[PDB]
Amino acid sequence: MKFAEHLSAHITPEWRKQYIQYEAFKDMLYSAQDQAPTVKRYFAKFEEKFFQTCEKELAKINTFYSEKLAEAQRRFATLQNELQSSLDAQHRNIKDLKLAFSEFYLSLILLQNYQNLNFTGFRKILKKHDKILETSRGADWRVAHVEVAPFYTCKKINQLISETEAVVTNELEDGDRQKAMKRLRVPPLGAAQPAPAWTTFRVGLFCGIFIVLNITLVLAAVFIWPLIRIYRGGFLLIEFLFLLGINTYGWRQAGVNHVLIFELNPRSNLSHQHLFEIAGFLGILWCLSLLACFFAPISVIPTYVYPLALYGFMVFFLINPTKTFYYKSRFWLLKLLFRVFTAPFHKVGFADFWLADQLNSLSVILMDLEYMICFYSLELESGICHKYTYGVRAIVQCIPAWLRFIQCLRRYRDTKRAFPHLVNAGKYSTTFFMVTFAALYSTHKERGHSDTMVFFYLWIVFYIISSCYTLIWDLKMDWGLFDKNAGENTFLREEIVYPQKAYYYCAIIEDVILRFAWTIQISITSTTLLPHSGDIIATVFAPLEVFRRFVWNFFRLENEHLNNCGEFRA
Amino acid sequence: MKFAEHLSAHITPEWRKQYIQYEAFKDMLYSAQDQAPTVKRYFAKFEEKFFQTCEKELAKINTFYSEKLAEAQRRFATLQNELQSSLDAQRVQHRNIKDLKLAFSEFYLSLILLQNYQNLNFTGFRKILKKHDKILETSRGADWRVAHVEVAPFYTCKKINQLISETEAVVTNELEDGDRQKAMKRLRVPPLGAAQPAPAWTTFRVGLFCGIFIVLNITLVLAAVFIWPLIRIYRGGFLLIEFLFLLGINTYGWRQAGVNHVLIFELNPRSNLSHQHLFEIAGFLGILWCLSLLACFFAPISVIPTYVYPLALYGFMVFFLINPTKTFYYKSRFWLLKLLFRVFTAPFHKVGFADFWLADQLNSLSVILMDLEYMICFYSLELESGICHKYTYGVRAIVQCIPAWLRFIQCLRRYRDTKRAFPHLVNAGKYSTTFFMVTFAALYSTHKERGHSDTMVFFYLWIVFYIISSCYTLIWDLKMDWGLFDKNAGENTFLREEIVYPQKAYYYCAIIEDVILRFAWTIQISITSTTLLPHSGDIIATVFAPLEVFRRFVWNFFRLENEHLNNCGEFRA
């Protein structure tokens, strides 16, 4: 039933062009039926053309399967050699070997699914052609060629699977098949695995509660402690989580193998539904805290505990040691954060750079944390922490840019490729220069030093430079657009995965606008350029920054899947 | 990966005992492996015993398959004869063609069920014998499968596939004028039972509506804590939403326990509402109800009177049930409209299971009708201040007894149709006890105002008939609706020989709740029908009506279970 949709869902994206073109055959058959008027000879010519196309597709499938089988055999040979060397040596090496064996088993299972689906598609398309043409020649062709095709009559893959299982059990697992087939099973992958019904119900419940609480908050607002600054970080984090769930959904639908790019376990992937559930729960907590602050239902309890607890809970949620509430994902995130914040002492993989960029787009959270620290230290001259700026504010603002710059320097050291890493480092240090000049101008504003205009002009120049640098890097390098190989997709690259180019153009325009918007937001937040409306401008701009980062994540992951722009894979 | 769960979720419940006992074989193999210590002799003995059980199961499967194949052949012959007669005959003809098409679809579905039975039994045999071979590290289970299972009649007979082909041909030729696509659009059988999970968007909508409902309920409670009787106006809506939610739970429980309500209710198996859709409808209606009540409490718009908010809600509900367009569950809405029309005109239609079941549901939802009549009285008179809440009249009693009247007339029609007096007349008397209780309560209430001197006699008669009605309804529920307290109980004390639900504690708690809430239901009907409690009657009725809905929910559970097990309602040949 609807074999085309099932095939499309179960097709491995990396081999999309190497599967059976079921839709093309369906379109050919329908066009032939529509154009049928001499009738017998026309039908004979159409049958000949269809058989030729089927033969071409069968040859393509056979050659692809043969090459993949040879690759699998070579991989098995090298893995066996590595296992023999490890045995001759006789813990971490054993773990790495087990991971490699699981990956090889996944590749074998993918090959088996490829051959099975190709055979099923051949059978289905031949049956459909026979039904439409009211002729039995399709079954004869299938039996003559497809039934005896090498891709369908090769059991070398099942034998490889059996040998891999036996080797894993006897050597790595110490002769117990029960331990094997776990981490070595390859459950349903991709869109072929519907999310749990309970997860979807929880996502819906959290979304509804969040919507109602947001409506209540809006009505209450329309009808001692700065709540905007405190809650902006939480709101931005919740928005980022929701937009990241959307990013994951789009990557799964667009065929972008973000699992491989992020070096995540293919057998256990946190679905977009789980991200939506986490975002909804965090938003529910955030809304409850804000409502409690507005109303103060408990008189004895102070108001300040309401935010402090909320974020604290989130912290306790992230650093929870109990194996519950996405414990594996939380531990992976904690390790990634530790690597990122200690960037110069670790290998900069794709995940580290991506999370550093996310932090760069989430510097408002760090700024709000520093502002809260200042408010607690001093305010508890009115508003001293807001009217006057200091160096620590600038350093906190530049911390994400510092992390990215040091990551780029480490990448340059590792690979010695000057051009990309050094250009990116300059593109991140433009931020240091801009923030430094803005802080100098703000500090000199209070004390007339006769050089305020010089610093203002320097800040404007470096603002323009940084905005142009970031925009050019995003459009040309992160997204790979404006390439010279665009045969038809003007201002884009030759290959695009997303259905519409209008998405690409809208993303280009929104990035152009929002890079300047975010640069303005950084300039306002890190100093006192606009003490009157600065807070509201930053609050309005930060969600726009998160949205820009979400679109950038979309297109950067697309480019990474299409091309090794980040050079994170051999 | 786990054939036990797949088999349990894919077995046809009506044939539950006719499938391979995969779980029993698993337990047997595990026990034998655990007791393994001489050793080879014990292994051989266990293998012999296990294979003897295998032959017994294979013989059972073959016999059942042969019986069902003979039944299918006879059904096909009868359908062919009927179709030939109809063709030779050529508004009644249109109905005859529709009925023949439905019968052919049902027979094709039975053929698909038999084919699924065959495939599942073969897969279970192969998977259990493979597990036995792996456990015993011997290549003999596969040999026995090849020698016996692979050559058994239930797997060496292709007559079911041939019958399926002939059914397709006949439906496509002499019932569809040669349009094969039209035939396959109705004969093809999608997954059944819990095989197909509900759509993700439907579950998300259910969750969203549940969350909105919860938050709005919390807001309503907070507003209440910190010109129009709102309790008597919104009780009907709240009870209807609760009843729909509990009905979704009932459908989920029937699906999980294997109670084939799709066949009991004569619903279309190829497409029927799941518990998720009922939850979604209940959540949306609850959202609307909560919004209306919040608008009443706050009145955000001053130009719009408060009375507009309730009415519109209920109006929308009506518009949500009689919507001509095919937009929102139109199939189920039209089926419910037809069932309601049949129930409210009971003495002119044959009483099927669905009609009696819906009449009973209404019997448990009489509070809605009472509230509607009270609001009619309020609008007629109040708009003595509280004249419609201080005295009782005949129309009030008639409205209270309307559902009981429908059930009683249905029982009388069933007696007139089947001519068996015992069950139908006992049930008719059970329902007429409600008439007697209501009328005596009304007489006492209307006589308590003037010194007729016969008030205490009416009060005593009302007490006697209240006890009589409570006992009658309880005995019918326990002995004639749930099929409990039977003489065939071997280990399920106070229950029947076969119980489909996992826990007997459920049955015991259901009996206790049935007793308590039957008495509560009788008390609430007495209080609401007439003055009786003139100050606390409304609160007691409001508290008890949800309890009546819960009682009707448990009763639905156990009545459907008993109907699936035994033909208690005699709605099937």
Ligand SMILES: CCCCC/C=C\C/C=C\CCCCCCCC(=O)O[C@H](COC(=O)CCCCCCCCCCCCCCC)COP(=O)([O-])OCC[N+](C)(C)C
């Ligand atoms: C000042 C710092 C501000 C906080 C830092 C910023 C953001 C934190 C949140 C998310 C960033 C990580 C996104 C990774 C996306 C990769 C693509 C994908 O979606 O793939 C997912 C990534 O899932 C993850 O691992 C983690 C996802 C994030 C879960 C959210 C946790 C709570 C967030 C709130 C933090 C509270 C902080 C308090 C405030 C300071 C694959 O999931 P898996 O289960 O296969 O994971 C791998 C597990 N193996 C390797 C065992 C299979």
Ligand SMILES: CCCCC/C=C\C/C=C\CCCCCCCC(=O)O[C@H](COC(=O)CCCCCCCCCCCCCCC)COP(=O)([O-])OCC[N+](C)(C)C
């Ligand atoms: C006294 C005042 C009014 C009292 C309340 C009235 C009615 C509610 C009671 C029961 C609803 C039916 C429950 C289904 C029982 C069978 C099991 C099952 O789940 O069967 C369902 C039937 O679904 C239903 O019928 C609909 C479910 C109920 C939805 C509620 C709609 C809104 C109601 C508004 C209330 C109006 C009052 C105005 C306010 C004052 C299977 O669906 P299918 O699609 O297979 O249907 C068969 C369709 N073929 C045969 C063509 C394929």
Ligand SMILES: O=P(O)(O)O[C@@H]1[C@@H](OP(=O)(O)O)[C@H](OP(=O)(O)OP(=O)(O)O)[C@@H](OP(=O)(O)O)[C@H](OP(=O)(O)OP(=O)(O)O)[C@@H]1OP(=O)(O)O
């Ligand atoms: O008679 P119909 O027209 O109602 O259904 C036929 C046809 O539909 P069609 O006319 O193209 O719309 C098939 O394609 P389809 O609509 O699902 O869709 P796609 O074009 O592939 O997207 C359908 O499923 P499938 O072959 O694609 O999986 C298949 O069902 P069924 O007997 O169960 O086949 P089995 O899987 O059990 O072998 C029937 O094939 P025939 O046996 O040759 O008559």
Ligand SMILES: O=P(O)(O)O[C@@H]1[C@@H](OP(=O)(O)O)[C@H](OP(=O)(O)OP(=O)(O)O)[C@@H](OP(=O)(O)O)[C@H](OP(=O)(O)OP(=O)(O)O)[C@@H]1OP(=O)(O)O
């Ligand atoms: O499977 P591995 O062998 O590659 O890695 C496993 C290993 O951790 P390592 O990497 O060596 O530090 C286990 O510790 P270990 O050596 O004492 O014992 P074992 O021989 O494995 O039993 C640990 O506890 P445990 O679960 O097995 O008891 C388990 O945690 P995890 O399932 O998350 O947590 P739970 O929710 O199940 O508690 C790891 O599972 P993965 O990370 O999913 O692979």
Ligand SMILES: O=P(O)(O)O[C@@H]1[C@@H](OP(=O)(O)O)[C@H](OP(=O)(O)OP(=O)(O)O)[C@@H](OP(=O)(O)O)[C@H](OP(=O)(O)OP(=O)(O)O)[C@@H]1OP(=O)(O)O
């Ligand atoms: O756990 P492992 O990996 O060491 O061995 C598992 C494997 O047995 P294997 O080696 O082929 O003999 C599964 O077969 P599989 O999917 O490959 O399929 P094929 O039949 O070959 O196509 C079998 O599933 P099942 O399909 O028979 O239902 C599963 O049974 P389990 O979950 O208990 O479920 P049930 O007993 O309730 O059915 C076994 O697990 P355990 O018995 O728990 O240890």
Ligand SMILES: O=P(O)(O)O[C@@H]1[C@@H](OP(=O)(O)O)[C@H](OP(=O)(O)OP(=O)(O)O)[C@@H](OP(=O)(O)O)[C@H](OP(=O)(O)OP(=O)(O)O)[C@@H]1OP(=O)(O)O
């Ligand atoms: O349920 P039914 O079979 O007893 O009755 C069907 C009948 O109309 P009715 O309801 O009896 O007045 C169809 O046309 P008809 O009179 O020529 O007679 P036949 O039934 O063919 O003899 C009608 O087709 P249409 O014009 O809408 O496409 C279809 O409408 P609708 O529910 O929207 O269903 P869909 O077709 O959109 O799926 C009805 O449901 P179904 O066929 O089950 O689907």
Ligand SMILES: CC(C)CCC[C@@H](C)[C@H]1CC[C@H]2[C@@H]3CC=C4C[C@@H](O)CC[C@]4(C)[C@H]3CC[C@]12C
């Ligand atoms: C602000 C103005 C100028 C432009 C705003 C354009 C926004 C709406 C554009 C920018 C990038 C776009 C996204 C790019 C990729 C995908 C993945 C696809 O599988 C679904 C649509 C989705 C999620 C797009 C939705 C629309 C989108 C978010």
Ligand SMILES: CC(C)CCC[C@@H](C)[C@H]1CC[C@H]2[C@@H]3CC=C4C[C@@H](O)CC[C@]4(C)[C@H]3CC[C@]12C
């Ligand atoms: C407090 C007392 C008096 C109420 C009576 C006990 C209630 C809790 C009992 C009575 C009947 C019971 C139900 C009977 C049948 C099923 C179907 C099963 O698949 C899941 C549990 C479920 C849904 C039970 C839940 C508990 C239940 C509702």
